[PDB]
């Protein structure tokens, strides 16, 4: 728990990628 609490910024971009993955796949 304490380890991931600091890595939360690294995970923030990971789940956020599922939002932009639709853009690149849409134009492709």
Swiss-Prot record:
Glycosylated position list: 19
Subcellular location: Virion membrane; Host cell membrane; Host endosome membrane
Region span, MPER: 7-28
Membrane topology according to the record: Single-pass type I membrane protein
Domain of life assignment: Viruses
Summary of subunit composition and partner proteins: The mature envelope protein (Env) consists of a homotrimer of non-covalently associated gp120-gp41 heterodimers. The resulting complex protrudes from the virus surface as a spike. There seems to be as few as 10 spikes on the average virion.
Function, in words: Acts as a class I viral fusion protein. Under the current model, the protein has at least 3 conformational states: pre-fusion native state, pre-hairpin intermediate state, and post-fusion hairpin state. During fusion of viral and target intracellular membranes, the coiled coil regions (heptad repeats) assume a trimer-of-hairpins structure, positioning the fusion peptide in close proximity to the C-terminal region of the ectodomain. The formation of this structure appears to drive apposition and subsequent fusion of viral and target cell membranes.
Name by which UniProt lists this protein: Transmembrane protein gp41
Organism encoding this protein: Human immunodeficiency virus type 1 group M subtype B (isolate SC) (HIV-1)
Range within the parent protein: 656 to 683 of 856
């Amino acid at each position: 728990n304490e380890q991931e609490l600091l890595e939360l910024d690294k995970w923030a971009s990971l789940w956020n990628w599922f939002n932009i993955t639709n853009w690149l796949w849409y134009i492709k």
